[PDB]
Motif scaffolding. Sequence first.
Motif, PDB file in Angstrom:
ATOM      1  N   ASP A  21      86.964 -30.328  64.292  1.00  0.00           N
ATOM      2  CA  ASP A  21      85.796 -30.776  63.550  1.00  0.00           C
ATOM      3  C   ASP A  21      85.388 -29.822  62.434  1.00  0.00           C
ATOM      4  O   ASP A  21      84.363 -30.052  61.787  1.00  0.00           O
ATOM      5  N   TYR A  22      86.144 -28.752  62.193  1.00  0.00           N
ATOM      6  CA  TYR A  22      85.714 -27.762  61.219  1.00  0.00           C
ATOM      7  C   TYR A  22      85.518 -28.364  59.818  1.00  0.00           C
ATOM      8  O   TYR A  22      84.461 -28.148  59.210  1.00  0.00           O
ATOM      9  N   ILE A  80      82.384 -30.389  59.305  1.00  0.00           N
ATOM     10  CA  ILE A  80      81.118 -29.668  59.356  1.00  0.00           C
ATOM     11  C   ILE A  80      80.957 -28.715  58.176  1.00  0.00           C
ATOM     12  O   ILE A  80      79.865 -28.604  57.610  1.00  0.00           O
ATOM     13  N   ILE A  81      82.040 -28.051  57.790  1.00  0.00           N
ATOM     14  CA  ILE A  81      82.074 -27.088  56.686  1.00  0.00           C
ATOM     15  C   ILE A  81      82.651 -27.783  55.455  1.00  0.00           C
ATOM     16  O   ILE A  81      83.850 -28.068  55.393  1.00  0.00           O
ATOM     17  N   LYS A  82      81.814 -28.035  54.447  1.00  0.00           N
ATOM     18  CA  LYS A  82      82.283 -28.737  53.258  1.00  0.00           C
ATOM     19  C   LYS A  82      82.935 -27.818  52.227  1.00  0.00           C
ATOM     20  O   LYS A  82      83.748 -28.289  51.419  1.00  0.00           O
ATOM     21  N   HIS A  83      82.615 -26.525  52.232  1.00  0.00           N
ATOM     22  CA  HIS A  83      83.138 -25.589  51.237  1.00  0.00           C
ATOM     23  C   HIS A  83      83.618 -24.332  51.943  1.00  0.00           C
ATOM     24  O   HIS A  83      82.899 -23.327  52.017  1.00  0.00           O
ATOM     25  N   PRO A  84      84.840 -24.353  52.483  1.00  0.00           N
ATOM     26  CA  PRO A  84      85.352 -23.171  53.192  1.00  0.00           C
ATOM     27  C   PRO A  84      85.481 -21.985  52.245  1.00  0.00           C
ATOM     28  O   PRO A  84      85.675 -22.145  51.033  1.00  0.00           O
ATOM     29  N   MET A  85      85.386 -20.779  52.813  1.00  0.00           N
ATOM     30  CA  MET A  85      85.447 -19.567  52.002  1.00  0.00           C
ATOM     31  C   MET A  85      85.886 -18.437  52.920  1.00  0.00           C
ATOM     32  O   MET A  85      85.531 -18.425  54.103  1.00  0.00           O
ATOM     33  N   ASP A  86      86.633 -17.475  52.364  1.00  0.00           N
ATOM     34  CA  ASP A  86      87.133 -16.326  53.109  1.00  0.00           C
ATOM     35  C   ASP A  86      87.397 -15.194  52.122  1.00  0.00           C
ATOM     36  O   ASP A  86      87.390 -15.386  50.903  1.00  0.00           O
ATOM     37  N   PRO A  97      91.727 -17.912  55.156  1.00  0.00           N
ATOM     38  CA  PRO A  97      91.029 -19.174  55.429  1.00  0.00           C
ATOM     39  C   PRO A  97      91.091 -19.503  56.908  1.00  0.00           C
ATOM     40  O   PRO A  97      92.103 -19.258  57.574  1.00  0.00           O
ATOM     41  N   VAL A  98      90.007 -20.095  57.417  1.00  0.00           N
ATOM     42  CA  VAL A  98      90.022 -20.592  58.782  1.00  0.00           C
ATOM     43  C   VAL A  98      91.125 -21.635  58.883  1.00  0.00           C
ATOM     44  O   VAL A  98      91.130 -22.628  58.139  1.00  0.00           O
ATOM     45  N   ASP A  99      92.069 -21.402  59.795  1.00  0.00           N
ATOM     46  CA  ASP A  99      93.136 -22.351  60.119  1.00  0.00           C
ATOM     47  C   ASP A  99      92.631 -23.245  61.241  1.00  0.00           C
ATOM     48  O   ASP A  99      92.843 -22.989  62.423  1.00  0.00           O
TER      49      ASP A  99
END
Length: 112
Positions: free
Chosen positions: A41-42, A45-51, A31-33
């Motif tokens: 601001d991540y 802007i990103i409502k549904h993170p994914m990795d 996941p983006v840390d």
Amino acid sequence: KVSEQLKCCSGILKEMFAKKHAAYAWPFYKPVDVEALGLHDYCDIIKHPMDMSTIKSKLEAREYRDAQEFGADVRLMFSNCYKYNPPDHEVVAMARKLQDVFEMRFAKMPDE
Ligand SMILES: Cc1nn(C)c(C)c1-c1cccc(-c2ccnc3nc[nH]c23)c1F
């Protein structure tokens, strides 16, 4: 059909995690840390993170019921990157290359 297709998908996932693609896949392994990266601001802007570790967990736990559900998650991961980043940023260049790998092999789905 469903079992076969999901196997095809897990093979794609194993490839995306493979050493042969690591030079551009590594930003998408976990996941983006946001905090560690200074990207305060991540979340906004990103409502549904994914990795790829989340996709792998969902595959192992049999959360995906079909290939389309898996593909939508993988594509969401790339879209989030294209959302957040200026298109000339290195991470976007790496996302585009990894999406090329994904789309060409996903196209080779057994379809019956
Ligand atoms: C630090 C760092 N240095 N370099 C050149 C890169 C590519 C990174 C980096 C490390 C870890 C994750 C990410 C990342 C992943 C997905 N989306 C993103 N959006 C902005 N950064 C994103 C990353 F860019």
